[PDB]
Design a protein around this ligand. Structure first.
Ligand SMILES: *C(=N)[C@H](C[C@@H]1CCCNC1=O)NC(=O)[C@H](CC1CC1)NC(=O)c1cc2cccc(Cl)c2[nH]1
Ligand SMILES: *C(=N)[C@H](C[C@@H]1CCCNC1=O)NC(=O)[C@H](CC1CC1)NC(=O)c1cc2cccc(Cl)c2[nH]1
Ligand code: NA
Ligand code: NA
Lengths: 305, 305
């Protein structure tokens, strides 16, 4: 028992991380087979951070302006191209530690692990959710650009995020095809993150984890309907709940014998009176960065190889 | 910026994890050079979980009763011995992925990463603190015995914890020399964890992290003394504060320009009036599982290779 914010084991990703330097800018890249992926803003200078024209900047480069280092070894860049907001650097050596991988774009509410890196060197791993406003609440210092987010499916690494910038305390990036999450661009403009909301299906999954781990004080005998629940959620900036969400919570309902709409009635109450100084799984706030699948994984115990 | 519960990258440990079976019991082992380390209770059955005599149980075994599997490969056990509460299984093949390592015993208040494993397969990584009562608040299901806790110092893995049991919701284990943290034994008795307290120097480190990240609302103009502070801490089950702790917080005081005893005055106030519905770094409780070093690492950015 117990319940922690748990990240995927990162070994498979650590072996893909490299350092990419162009000019006086150094950041991280992802080396899979014979391609290094990194944020295209590595080709920027100071003059072009406000209004860059990346096609122009790229045409003025040649392969030898790109220093790519895998630990000690240097990788020879033999070609380059741009795909949306990433740069693909073709190198002379295929990474022998290339895992089985795929590139997937995630949806708001889903969680992933981030391997934070500096100078191509892994520093820390943590779990976060993609927020409804398409940012993540990460932990990133200067030089972390190119750090990746990922999930593991059995033996397969699904890369879903590459870090590009910080915007007023939160973080924005792209999928691995270079397309931004959210309405952001990789230049200096007046862009800000929109209003965030709380991910309701994740809060319910976490309340089930609490029950599984013996925290029951917030339960009550009432039931509610999707529509009466969603009527109260909207007042509190909670995402509305769909029948799809009810179905996804099925396994957890089964294992605890508490119907989803039963548990919604407890959530309704918590929204209207607060916690009154009580805690749930060691938190005094309602936690929304665990998906139903995260809970099952952690409260039933699936592994990966 | 941002602040997360961040674990060490686990690649270096993942390559040491193996599966150990004896009889109908399967759990995890740590394979370093040509020795596999695992909890000695793998030699127990049902009859001997209450009052085992491990020396007797071990003499009745031979090397071939130990099935050790590293993924697919089987490792031939060529010798065994017991060291306190661990078993050391000598195997015919030295692990080629043995990192530079050492065995260290940690103190209450210090943090480490846990690589939770099942059947020798890594499942998740998370950060936790050794509590003042010598337990950890982990997340572990049946079969996680032998999972290890570790820190990384540059290129060197310091193993500090091997998981042995769950005791009423929390977790207890040994160092890698087989000596228990805390007054626990690896048998079924009436043992329970003693009273826990809050790790004050860690709370102060976290308040500094908050300031570094722009949360300043709890600061005030007052100062206090070690003795007046510790007088209030004791009422709230906070560990007393020493001059050693003040010195360790030095770097953080320097970087924020807030003296330690200054920050203690803010903590005093928070203890006496609570948060009044406000949050600090996204928490509504005072967090004590980040050490001063964790904060510096995360709010300044040291890496490892
Ligand atoms: C990538 N290496 C770097 C990481 C940033 C730096 C700030 C703290 N954390 C991070 O995630 N980001 C970077 O170079 C981008 C590049 C953009 C495309 C032009 N810029 C920023 O994220 C950035 C710069 C500044 C300056 C002042 C205030 C803020 Cl919020 C900034 N964000
Ligand atoms: C090791 N594989 C296993 C892991 C435990 C199982 C319970 C949930 N989480 C864990 O960490 N633990 C194990 O075999 C030990 C062995 C001891 C030395 C004899 N036992 C327990 O941790 C255990 C068994 C039970 C039964 C009922 C209640 C509790 Cl708290 C128990 N703890
Ligand atoms: Na109810
Ligand atoms: Na003060």
């Amino acid at each position: 028992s117990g319940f922690r914010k748990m990240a995927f084991p990162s070994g498979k990703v650590e072996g893909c991380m490299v350092q990419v330097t162009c000019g006086t800018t150094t950041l991280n890249g992802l080396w899979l087979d014979d391609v290094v992926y990194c944020p295209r803003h590595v080709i920027c200078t100071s003059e072009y951070m406000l209004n860059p024209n990346y096609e122009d900047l790229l045409i003025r480069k040649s392969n030898h302006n790109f220093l790519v280092q895998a630990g000690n070894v240097q990788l020879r860049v033999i070609g380059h191209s741009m795909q949306n907001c990433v740069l693909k650097l073709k190198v002379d050596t295929a990474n022998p530690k290339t895992p089985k991988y795929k590139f997937v774009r995630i949806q708001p509410g889903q969680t992933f692990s981030v391997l934070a890196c500096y100078n191509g060197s892994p520093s820390g791993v943590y779990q976060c959710a993609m927020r409804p406003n398409f940012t993540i609440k990460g932990s990133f210092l200067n030089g972390s650009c190119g750090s990746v987010g990922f999930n593991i499916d059995y033996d397969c690494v699904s890369f879903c995020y590459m870090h590009h910038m910080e915007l007023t305390g939160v973080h924005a990036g792209t999928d691995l095809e270079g397309n931004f999450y959210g309405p952001f661009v990789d230049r200096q403009t007046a862009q800000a993150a929109g209003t965030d909301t709380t991910i309701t299906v994740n809060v319910l999954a976490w309340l089930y984890a609490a029950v599984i781990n013996g925290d029951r004080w917030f339960l009550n005998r009432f039931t509610t309907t999707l529509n009466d629940f969603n009527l109260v959620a909207m007042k509190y900036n909670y995402e509305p709940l769909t029948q799809d969400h009810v179905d996804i919570l099925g396994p957890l309902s089964a294992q605890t014998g508490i119907a989803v709409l039963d548990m919604c009635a407890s959530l309704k109450e918590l929204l209207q009176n607060g916690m009154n100084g009580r805690t749930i799984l060691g938190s005094a706030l309602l936690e929304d960065e665990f998906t139903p699948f995260d809970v099952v994984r952690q409260c039933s115990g699936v592994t990966f190889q």
